[PDB]
């Protein structure tokens, strides 16, 4: 659980970990919201408008030599009960994807090239950082990986979510 036996591949909170994220649609879906020690978060909350399918993906992440990587997501959202008067299709989850690639400048990855890792929900585990934010923590892993690197993606289909941080690492031998 320390840096002595884990190699970080991506840390959204770090200097060069914030640049490279792409939102589809570019506007009206996932949007950056700084929160502050400033942190670049990505949020989406189109609970009134119908048929939402908003995507957010990272830049190319090398797996170095990892056969298996770990994805730790810290986030928070609003239950549909907390939002009276929303569409009957209000969601409380989102989807986590990945696409392996040897190329570092893919400019046309489609929904069907991305493979779903799991549905992410606000569950039992969380963390706590003038004030303190209480954020759900979820961790998922994928493997075996084979290509030089990979892309990560997040899909919103009508929820009110705030992605506070995303961390990608693997475990030393």
């Amino acid at each position: 659980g320390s840096h002595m036996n884990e190699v970080t591949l991506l840390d959204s909170r770090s200097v060069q970990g914030e640049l490279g994220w792409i939102a589809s649609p570019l506007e009206g879906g996932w949007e950056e919201v700084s929160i502050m020690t400033p942190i670049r978060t990505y949020q989406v909350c189109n609970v009134m408008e119908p048929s939402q399918n908003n995507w957010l993906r990272t830049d190319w992440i090398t797996r170095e030599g990892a056969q298996r990587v770990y994805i730790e997501i810290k986030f928070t959202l609003r239950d549909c009960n907390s939002l009276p008067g929303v569409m009957g299709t209000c969601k409380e989850t989102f989807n986590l994807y990945y696409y392996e690639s040897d190329n570092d400048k893919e400019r046309f990855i489609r929904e069907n090239q991305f493979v779903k890792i799991d549905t992410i929900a606000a569950d039992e585990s969380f963390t706590q950082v003038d004030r303190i934010m209480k954020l759900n923590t979820e961790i998922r892993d994928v493997g075996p990986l084979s290509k030089k690197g990979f892309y990560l993606a997040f899909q919103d289909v009508g929820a009110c979510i705030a992605l506070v941080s995303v961390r990608v690492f693997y475990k030393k031998a």
Binding site: V33, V44, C45, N46, L83
Partner: peptide, 11 residues
Amino acid sequence: XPYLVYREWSP
């Protein structure tokens, strides 16, 4: 057209 924004939540 975010209904709410988390900073707490606000419109």
